[PDB]
Amino acid sequence: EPTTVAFDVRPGGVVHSFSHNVGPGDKYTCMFTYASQGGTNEQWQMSLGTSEDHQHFTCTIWRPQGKSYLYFTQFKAEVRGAEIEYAMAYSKAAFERESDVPLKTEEFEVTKTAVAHRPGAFKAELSKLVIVAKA
């Protein structure tokens, strides 16, 4: 029943996935799959929001305070069975004196169901993903 859940983003280079679902029959699903290098785990948050029209929903994945130290070698946020209407990925998110810093055009790709890194162009820094979708 919580709409927001905490999860650990783990270094070590092995691929991990974390997912959360809300709504009748887990209608609204969001999954974050990644692999990273680093010294410590990072507790991130995944929030799923639902709108009045029973169709639109949002998935927001982020690291509190907007800075991540992990070297991501891959990432993919997926909303299976849904259609993305808006999405943005950030290397750094706004906090105190820092501004949001969107990933550069070449770093990622937005398909109907996913926001994913672009192999060979992604710069490895990520701290926030925002997805607005229609179930």
Numbering used by the authors: 3 to 137
Quote what the paper states about this structure.
The MYDGF structure consists of 10 antiparallel β-strands forming two β-sheets, which are packed face to face to each other, forming a β-sandwich. The β-strands are connected by loops of 3–18 amino acid lengths and enclose a hydrophobic interior. A single disulfide bond between cysteine residues 32 and 61 of β-strands 3 and 5, respectively, bridges the opposing β-sheets. The asymmetric unit (ASU) contains two molecules of MYDGF forming a close contact. Analysis using PISA suggests that this dimer with a buried surface area of 1726 Å2 may be a physiologically relevant form. However, analysis of MYDGF by analytical size-exclusion chromatography clearly indicates that MYDGF is monomeric in solution.
MYDGF, previously named c19orf10 (chromosome 19 open reading frame 10), is a poorly characterized protein, which was identified as a paracrine-acting protein that is secreted by monocytes and macrophages. Human MYDGF has 142 amino acids and consists of an N-terminal 31-residue-long signal peptide and the MYDGF protein sequence containing a C-terminal KDEL-like ER retention sequence. According to its primary amino acid sequence, MYDGF does not belong to any known cytokine or growth factor family. Treatment with recombinant MYDGF helps to protect and repair the heart after acute MI.
